[PDB]
Design a protein around this ligand. Structure first.
Ligand SMILES: OC[C@H]1O[C@H](O)[C@H](O)[C@@H](O)[C@@H]1O
Ligand SMILES: [K+]
Length: 453
């Protein structure tokens, strides 16, 4: 019965309508975000603020710079990346180019063991890399892209406030991250490095986009996690001395909602994802968006649909009932389907399911709902930052460039398009250019290191 397939699809639509956010909902989220951002910048409310607005000590005038060979480290995902990057004088300023690169999978027992284990592993990887390229012992300036909330005292010194994205290594929170890295390198003792700069991935991304676009003063990550940085007026950065020029601020907007600010928008699936995560009650805005959580959100929606007898004859496979089994890349692949249902079919088949045609269509709709809410929620955050910037500055029309990295933004067929449209609706009187970084974290880390060096 085509009539009863259609009836199944109308029921699915009623359940899926819960993910809708209206323009006014997004404006409410945006205003709330802006409020928390104000609170994060002020000495009086900083400690209470869920959105920390952390000074990076990356400034508008980095005085000068330096050229030569730079090593970049990137820790923040399931993979740890080492690369050699060359920084050199161009016609606009410094260019940077990725030349030798290697990536290492972090063992499970290193991300959730002790900080000694984690940083020992990192030091081992740095040795392996320097071996493969004979650039060993030698001393090189090292830039560390370290994609977790850090309270900086300077560019080369900052403490880990808390792990995010499933990181749980004991003995790291409250300690100087550069210190933890130097200590581990010294314990191995088979090379020496000049640790010159530590930066957030958002910041690395913004920096890497400058040489090509000097209007880039926002960096955004929509990958495993979700965060943004931007160039704030020094007069508004109350935690740092001085009123002149600008400093990059790491919003850590992922923790937005951790004081209840998103409560009316959270769905059962969100509560379930939060509760089975490594950091329950934390990073709640990020959990609506980030790749670490998106596929899992879809899996939970599909389980609700099977339990309602609307999908897969009401039976869920072992794989479908396995945590993390619906990968976030499957969300993108499903929404890449050209209409013949082939891509969707093959995903669900490899998950042990026997999908029908309408099963495939419902799974598409489930993915679209989760990823569209992610796009819309993210848009409210970026719009809040950009509207903030426009007001802080002297601008009837603000023209700004946003530098972006992360697999969700880059590889999802329609996230990007839905995101841009929503951001534009919320930012009248702004002309926003989006740029995707190419090796943003590696080249960014090198460029900041060149300045600090
Ligand atoms: O990797 C993207 C983001 O993931 C997380 O939210 C971290 O807290 C943040 O530092 C980072 O920028
Ligand atoms: K200040």
């Amino acid at each position: 019965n085509l009539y009863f397939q259609g009836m199944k699809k109308e029921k699915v639509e009623q359940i899926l309508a819960e993910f809708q956010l209206q323009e006014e909902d997004l404006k409410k989220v945006m205003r709330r975000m802006q409020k928390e951002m104000d609170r994060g910048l002020r000495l009086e409310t900083h400690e209470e603020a869920s959105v920390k607005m952390l000074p990076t000590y990356v400034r508008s005038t980095p005085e000068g710079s330096e050229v030569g060979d730079f090593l970049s480290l990137d820790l923040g995902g399931t993979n740890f990346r080492v690369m050699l990057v060359k920084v050199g004088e161009g016609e606009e300023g410094q260019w940077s180019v990725k030349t030798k690169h290697q990536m290492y999978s972090i063992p499970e027992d290193a991300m959730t063991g002790t900080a000694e284990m984690l940083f020992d592993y990192i030091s081992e990887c740095i040795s392996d890399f320097l071996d493969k390229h004979q650039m060993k012992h030698k001393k090189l300036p090292l830039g560390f892209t370290f994609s977790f909330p850090v309270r900086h005292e300077d560019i080369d010194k900052g403490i880990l406030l808390n792990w995010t994205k499933g990181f749980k290594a004991s003995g790291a929170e409250g300690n100087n991250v550069v210190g933890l890295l130097r200590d581990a390198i010294k314990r191995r003792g088979d090379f020496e490095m000049d640790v010159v700069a530590m930066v957030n991935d958002t910041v690395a991304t913004m920096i890497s986009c400058y040489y090509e676009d000097h209007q880039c003063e926002v960096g955004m990550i929509v990958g495993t996690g979700c965060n943004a940085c931007y160039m704030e007026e020094m007069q508004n950065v109350e935690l740092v001395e001085g009123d002149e020029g600008r400093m990059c601020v790491n919003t850590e907007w992922g923790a937005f909602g951790d004081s209840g600010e998103l409560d009316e928008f959270l769905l059962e699936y969100d509560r379930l994802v939060d509760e089975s995560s490594a950091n329950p009650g934390q990073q709640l805005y990020e959990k609506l968006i980030g790749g670490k959580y998106m596929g899992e959100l879809v899996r939970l929606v599909l389980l609700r649909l099977v339990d309602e007898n609307l999908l897969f004859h009401g039976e869920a496979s072992e794989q479908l009932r396995t945590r993390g089994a619906f990968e976030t890349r499957f969300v993108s692949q499903v929404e890449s389907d050209t209409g013949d249902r082939k891509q969707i079919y093959n995903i669900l088949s490899t998950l042990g399911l026997r999908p029908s045609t309408t099963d495939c269509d419902i799974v598409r709709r489930a993915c679209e709902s989760v990823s569209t809410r992610a796009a819309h929620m993210c848009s409210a955050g970026l719009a809040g930052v950009i509207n903030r910037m426009r007001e802080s500055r002297s601008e009837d029309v603000m023209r700004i460039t946003v530098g972006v990295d992360g697999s969700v933004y880059k590889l999802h067929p329609s996230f990007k398009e839905r995101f841009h449209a929503s951001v534009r609706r919320l930012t009248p009187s702004c002309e926003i250019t989006f740029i995707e970084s190419e090796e943003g974290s590696g080249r960014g880390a090198a460029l900041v290191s060149a300045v600090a060096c």
